[PDB]
Amino acid sequence: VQLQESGGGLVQAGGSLRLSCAASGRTSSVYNMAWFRQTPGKEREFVAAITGNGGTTLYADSVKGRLTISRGNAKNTVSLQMNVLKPDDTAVYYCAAGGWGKERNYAYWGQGTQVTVSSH
């Protein structure tokens, strides 16, 4: 199983981005999926997660009411709607799958997509 991300980029503060992630390869399960983020010299930190059936979500406090995680239509797809972005949201964002909770013990990881939020 491999994970591919899209939707990153450079955006002005107050703007919005929608990150997307999709599993490729034969998956034998519907997985829980998550997003983490990493700034230079620091660790990947939890942002949000959603269970396989879409019924349960978990969010870091710093993004509550601004970021919303959801499942996509295809099997093992997830989106992260990022609104009201701030410069501190600048990071590489990683999709993960196969796990639960806020630690980095998820079985599958994407290779990251850069988000940069700039004042304008």
Residues within the interface to Cl ion (CB under 5 A): 31-32, 43-44, 98
Tokens 């992260």 correspond to 80
By beta-carbon proximity to Cl ion, the closer residue of 63 and 97 is 97
The angle subtended at Cα 102 by Cα 96 and Cα 94, nearest 5°, is 30
Which pair of tokens denotes residue 8?
A: 């990153």
CB neighbour list of residue 92: distance below 8 Å, 6 or more residues apart: 37, 38, 39, 112, 113, 114, 115
Q: How far is the CB of 12 from Cl ion (least distance, A)?
A: 28
By beta-carbon proximity to Cl ion, the closer residue of 20 and 100 is 100
By beta-carbon proximity to Cl ion, the closer residue of 11 and 106 is 106
Which pair of tokens denotes residue 83?
A: 């609104």
Q: How far is the CB of 37 from Cl ion (least distance, A)?
A: 10
Q: How far is the CB of 84 from Cl ion (least distance, A)?
A: 26
